[PDB]
Amino acid sequence: EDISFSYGWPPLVCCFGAAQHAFVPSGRPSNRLVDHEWHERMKDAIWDPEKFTRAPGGCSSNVAVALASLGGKVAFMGKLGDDDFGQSLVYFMNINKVQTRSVRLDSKKATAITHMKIGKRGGLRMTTTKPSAEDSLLKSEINIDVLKEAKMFYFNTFSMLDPNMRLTTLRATKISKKLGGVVFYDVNLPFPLWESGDKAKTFIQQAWDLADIIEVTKQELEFLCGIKPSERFDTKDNDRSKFTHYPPEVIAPLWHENLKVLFVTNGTSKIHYYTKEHNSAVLGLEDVPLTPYTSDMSASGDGIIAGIIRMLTVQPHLMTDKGYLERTLKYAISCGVVDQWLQARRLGYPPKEGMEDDVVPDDHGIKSVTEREYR
Amino acid sequence: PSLSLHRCGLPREIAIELFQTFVIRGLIRQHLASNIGVAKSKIREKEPIVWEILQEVMQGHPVLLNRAPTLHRLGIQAFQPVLVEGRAICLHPLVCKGFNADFDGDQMAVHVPLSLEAQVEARLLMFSHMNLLSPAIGDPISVPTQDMLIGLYVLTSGNHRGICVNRYNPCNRKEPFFSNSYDAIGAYRQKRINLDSPLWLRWRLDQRVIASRETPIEVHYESLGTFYEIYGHYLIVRSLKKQILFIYIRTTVGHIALYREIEEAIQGFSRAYS
Amino acid sequence: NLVFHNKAINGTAMKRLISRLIDHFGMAYTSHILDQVKTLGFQQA
Amino acid sequence: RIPFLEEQVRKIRDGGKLLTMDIHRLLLNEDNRFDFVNEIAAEAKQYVENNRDEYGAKKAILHVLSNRMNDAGVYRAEAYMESDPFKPGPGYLKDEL
Amino acid sequence: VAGRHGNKGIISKILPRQDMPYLQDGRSVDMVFNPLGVPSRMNVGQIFECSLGLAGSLLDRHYRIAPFDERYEQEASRKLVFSELYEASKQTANPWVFEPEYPGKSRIFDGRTGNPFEQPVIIGKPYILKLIHQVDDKIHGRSSGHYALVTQQPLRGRAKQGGQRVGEMEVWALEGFGVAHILQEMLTY
Amino acid sequence: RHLYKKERLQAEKEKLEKIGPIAYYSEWVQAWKKDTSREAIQKHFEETGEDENTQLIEMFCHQTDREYRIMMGTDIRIPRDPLAMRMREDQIKQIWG
Amino acid sequence: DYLVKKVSAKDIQELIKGERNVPLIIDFYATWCGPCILMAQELEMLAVEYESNALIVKVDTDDEYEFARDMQVRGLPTLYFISPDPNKDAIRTEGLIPIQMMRDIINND
Amino acid sequence: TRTLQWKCVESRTDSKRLYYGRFILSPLMKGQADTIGIAMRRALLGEIEGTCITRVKSEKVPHEYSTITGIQESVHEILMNLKEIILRSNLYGTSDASICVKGPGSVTAQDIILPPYVEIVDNTQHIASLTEPIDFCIGLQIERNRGYLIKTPHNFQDGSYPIDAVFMPVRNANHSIHSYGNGNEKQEILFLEIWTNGSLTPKEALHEASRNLIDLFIPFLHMEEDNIALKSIFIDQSELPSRIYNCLKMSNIYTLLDLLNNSQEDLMKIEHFRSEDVKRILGILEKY
Amino acid sequence: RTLQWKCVESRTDSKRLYYGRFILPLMKGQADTIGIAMRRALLGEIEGTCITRVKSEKVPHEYSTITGIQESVHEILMNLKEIILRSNLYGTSDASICVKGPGSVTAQDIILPPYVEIVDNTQHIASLTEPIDFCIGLQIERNRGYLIKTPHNFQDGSYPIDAVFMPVRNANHSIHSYGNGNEKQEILFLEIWTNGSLTPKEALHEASRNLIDLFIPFLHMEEDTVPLSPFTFHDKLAKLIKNKKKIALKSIFIDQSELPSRIYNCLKMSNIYTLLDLLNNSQEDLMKIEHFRSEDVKRILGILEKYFVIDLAKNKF
Ligand SMILES: [Mg+2]
Ligand SMILES: [Zn+2]
């Protein structure tokens, strides 16, 4: 009981999962609210992706770096390497104020490398020859004390992909619930599980059951529920065929007794919320500086999640209020747009032509003024 | 206007002429040129380095300025030159009375003191800070004069008192109370109050307010023992033990602003010395 | 340690004050006071 | 301690007003000003005669005065010389309007 | 630069349009003059001319008025200026051009902060001229140089690349200070 | 003189509050010929979903630039005397005679 | 021109069966992803450094969904490093990884 | 590479109630610095949100001006002492708090009972001092607003007295510019100085102001979903019957352009006019 | 939503003048901040394209005159300084004029590159009254502000013109009350006048983006050889561990040197995140932190010593 002495006001939040650098779980077709007329006039100098595809979000380390920026207290639990990559990844997190006490480092396993058997004809690889460090975590190593202090747990479906790791994760979820925690599940379905809907619902049903708050992209909601898309997906107008609010009944099949809220996201363009007694949506901006490196829209995802976490954590009593939820949603849209913008400025643009730019040891990049040069 | 009392602004073209010998030395000392002839060439092409050297050379070297009809000593005074771009000499607003100068076509002359002995005399005996009193009767020569005076008057001018502020007699029927002066200055910025609006400020110090010798307008005395005394510009609350519990002053934001500047300047100079 | 003034300042009054400040604090302090009052005057005007 | 005097103190040191304050302290120990000017001039000459090449951006008169103050207990930089921490690069000049 | 009523001044700063004072129409004023000058110099003519200028620009009229108009009636000039300002205010709908409470003056704003200046100010379009005395002709400097034949002193004149004079009155001032070394230098080296 | 302008300006504040935003600002839009009572505005929200703000924005879309320029006396920053704004031509002329 | 060459799913199959003497590196990529555009640039350097001591090829995931599911792609920026000795195993790396790491693997596995 | 960067150059914590920081920004093109400074100073001094005590309820007595029992201080002095208490919170809505002490000798300070969200920056601040044993019970109300000082004062249902609240966390802010231009181009540096009450750090305030500013200008970018010869013809020339002519001239219609501008509803306002006449004017126009 | 914006009026007075007015319920102090920032950005932060140098083939100087043309070379040059152009890209581009015969050379006669486009089509360059040949060469650029004609020295036949690159002629704003009683809400109106290179609405959007780009830098990480690289953290650390002892000490964080939680939490709260911080802090100081015992100093010292030998201030005298 060191709680009185050491807990502190911003409640601790714990993000569980894998630490990776630039990893995208999946990508699906999408639509965005944009000014079509500006785009025509500035055709020469603006990057507009030809077919727009949006990533659901990113790895859990990314969600944690984002909360820390907004002011939250965050910890990351997981396993990594003591190889150079690992040690460097821990430094990033540490410099960005994410507590790393919960991470555990191991000598034998490697940071992003998974030895795999060549497999049967048809190239069906077997990944069990040696597991990677990230998916190799054991029940014994979970840090109970961090779990005890925390009032929020965040996990993704990626950590449920490996068979041993699934077990570890479910235990962390159950330990937390008892001790007292709100569990937030972000279904960010990876590439393998898109083969068919039935298979997906069954894979994730146990997790869906244990969660107080869930976040699903619209495309995912349709895939799980059944609807097949009938939207143009490549046109120059905003028509309302896209951006639909599914009626409450279509969503009701998936509810369970412990679910307080469900958030469905169309990007920063629209965010929808469904609660047992009320339903609504808030609208936002997606016409943001986009570069070839940043077109995926992953950064916005991480930012939206972080805002929803900060707000729900600071005043816990109001998760189900109609007003609080609307204010939370607006703060989230703003955090997302700031993040996509910042990334573009940081990463830069790939050299258009006349690529005589100095090359960093691994790659080359230029500022926007430079991209927009005459020939 | 922005210059300090010890400084003057000298056009760069004038300076390069007056300080040339000094710059040539510098170019040679830093070995950026081989010979005197070599350097004079660098000065002509207006290369950027010549400018860094010029700035270095004039940093602690004073200069002398004079106006044409030199009626009295104050006609010549010394300043520390600051390089400026443009072709006119900038002068501090408060030194104009001594020089009898106005800004409608007047011109001035500059001289540079070459010897060490000469240079000491200028810094120590011919700078404005040292010569703030006129020779004839002892009066101040550098005092705020035109626009500056307008501003000071406006700050301290005051507020409408009776018929001007209220239409009907107050009988049939100001409010802000502030605890520290900083808060008051703040409200002015946030537009909560205006410059002339009356306010009450707590005073912890000792009755320094210049006011007439006037007895209290009303003394209100209560049975348990506290007495409140209302004078025109102040309220003094006292108790049975005859101790002054509180003093409050009726004033305007403008008055507090002048006091604060004079006080802060004194304290700042003190903390700098240390 | 200075007086608090609750009435207007005109040119005669400023000369009297600069004189009084020169005697109490000296020419160095007075020069700084003077530069600061100038700034305030220009700003308000 | 008055709460917000930081800028004024930075400026007094940076502006060169420190030198003015110092000259005044030192003249409070002397009956004839004219003699003090002569004493300082002589010291400066000795300094330049002994080490000629140090001077040029460092001025001798300033050195004599800083040395007096440091002897009496007030820390002053040598020759009242201060660097510009934030200059953009070589060959860049500040516009002191 | 100068106007036609005895008003002369020297330019001190050029500022970007954004920082200039601005009107209720949005436009930014070209020049700013001190207002403490008129009481001392006694020219009330300028105030009448600035105001009529604003009117003519708006209404597209030029006015040629002969001197001594008060022969016809008392306060004739005021009647002309005030009437014309009103017509401009009505025809082009700018109510600030004629303000009934303070005629000829308006309220303007600061470019730097967006805030209104406190008291109403005089705005107008007068005619300003540029004088032959320019800085470029005026500036001069010298170090070393050619020296005269008999007196062996420096030459006189900017054209001649010469020095400046330290004369009788200047010596006297240097003597008052007690700066002997400085003076000797001027007289010898 | 000041005491009286203040009284007139306070009365204008009160009318805006009683009448509502759409009604007060309609003096200066003459092309709106539609009921502006608070009770008329609620009925439109019930029937079409457009609230007060959307209705106000629609009104201003019918205002001429000449009329906007006359409405600037209603600015919070530099308010104009209500008497001067609504004075007739005959009255103003008497200022000059 | 580009040293890296896009390859069809079927052709890759042929390669696995046939003999190899230098390490093959396979990159699964998608047009949409931002990290992959950066990744392509770094692989290209390696191609120069190895200089015919390796074959580097790429498959676009969106066109060949099934091939990818079989070789176990989990996320978009994925690299499979394979070897000539068909008893030594394969390496899958997930995420942008530094160049020195890539270099070590080709040499020591 | 010509990328704007920000650093903190000076920091100091004088008391638990005063903090100072100085910040710098990288080279900016001319004209940029002053715009950035003016806006930031405005956001810092007005857009940041603070928590403070709005209303106090003293149950012991109803007298407007009466020192009660043991307390050495006046009712008004306590109200002043309460207004100077600094708090940190993340509240949406309002909350209540109380202080209850029973002290023979009291140094009432830090006895406030607060909800978990609200927090107290300085324990030592002195609410009051009680000389004799007595029970002190006060109820308080706390709110979070962005330096908006007040609303209309509400009714004193009980002896509940309102407190004038300044909700401003940042105490002062100032800006400065240095221009270091040589040769071809000029570069500038912005220097920003922030002083705070300890509810937030100066660096935190800097970040908050930037975020507040960005949300103000984002609305402009939002996109919504998608589903004269006549002048010179005068009425005198087009023959019109007298009664109509006199009436039109009465109402200031003098030229044709003007009749067109007018509408049928408008006509019925001029007096002595008739609807049949509106038909006749149409007929006259019809002939053109 | 709550806040809504619209264009209340739009007009095109001339090909070179355009107008627009826009409307915006805003809180009590918000309107002033938005208005001032927008004015300063509209008149000041928007860029434009203009002709910067001209090549007249056979003229002695600019104050000369040529036969068949009613204007001097100085007058033709002034007329060019007034031509309006539209482009989105940077760098210099070249264009030419080659009309012949009696008539008028107007803007249409300029032949342009693909990216630059003229706006007016009727602007007058010169008046030609004999059968003559007019051939000129022009250079166009995009930049901001105004340019002084610094290169007086020039290639033969080339003369410069002081271009003003500002595309917005004027701006105004007004603030009025929404009359909501206790909540003081306000309505903002903005008006913009443009040369026609860009629409007023486009100027409004460009200004908003430019303003966000000037306030976004603060939310990046503090600065403490190439930017724009994904691997800046890794490369930095690789040097930090390799380069210096006492600087490697920065790399180590309290989290890695495992400690019991009670101690860890307390240390973090008291601004201690790294070892160099712990070593620097005094033993006595540790007693200063609240809820810190005597047993803990021992624990920290015992774990620390195992990890490393040094006691910079850890060792008391
Ligand atoms: Mg004169
Ligand atoms: Zn007359």
UniProtKB/TrEMBL annotation, chain B:
<feature type="binding site">
    <location>
        <position position="104"/>
    </location>
    <ligand>
        <name>Mg(2+)</name>
    </ligand>
</feature>
<feature type="binding site">
    <location>
        <position position="106"/>
    </location>
    <ligand>
        <name>Mg(2+)</name>
    </ligand>
</feature>
<comment type="similarity">
    <text>Belongs to the RNA polymerase beta' chain family. RpoC1 subfamily.</text>
</comment>
<comment type="function">
    <text>DNA-dependent RNA polymerase catalyzes the transcription of DNA into RNA using the four ribonucleoside triphosphates as substrates.</text>
</comment>
<protein>
    <recommendedName>
        <fullName>DNA-directed RNA polymerase subunit gamma</fullName>
    </recommendedName>
</protein>
<feature type="binding site">
    <location>
        <position position="102"/>
    </location>
    <ligand>
        <name>Mg(2+)</name>
    </ligand>
</feature>
Automatic annotation (TrEMBL), chain D:
<protein>
    <submittedName>
        <fullName>Protein PLASTID TRANSCRIPTIONALLY ACTIVE 7-like isoform X2</fullName>
    </submittedName>
</protein>
<dbReference type="GO" id="GO:0042793">
    <property type="term" value="P:plastid transcription"/>
</dbReference>
<dbReference type="GO" id="GO:0000427">
    <property type="term" value="C:plastid-encoded plastid RNA polymerase complex"/>
</dbReference>
From TrEMBL, chain F:
<protein>
    <submittedName>
        <fullName>Protein PLASTID TRANSCRIPTIONALLY ACTIVE 12</fullName>
    </submittedName>
</protein>
Automatic annotation (TrEMBL), chain G:
<comment type="similarity">
    <text>Belongs to the thioredoxin family. Plant CITRX-type subfamily.</text>
</comment>
<comment type="function">
    <text>Probable thiol-disulfide oxidoreductase that may play a role in proper chloroplast development.</text>
</comment>
<feature type="disulfide bond">
    <location>
        <begin position="33"/>
        <end position="36"/>
    </location>
</feature>
<keyword id="KW-0934">Plastid</keyword>
<keyword id="KW-0813">Transport</keyword>
<dbReference type="GO" id="GO:0045454">
    <property type="term" value="P:cell redox homeostasis"/>
</dbReference>
<feature type="domain" description="Thioredoxin">
    <location>
        <begin position="1"/>
        <end position="109"/>
    </location>
</feature>
<dbReference type="GO" id="GO:0009507">
    <property type="term" value="C:chloroplast"/>
</dbReference>
<keyword id="KW-0560">Oxidoreductase</keyword>
<keyword id="KW-0809">Transit peptide</keyword>
<keyword id="KW-0676">Redox-active center</keyword>
<keyword id="KW-0150">Chloroplast</keyword>
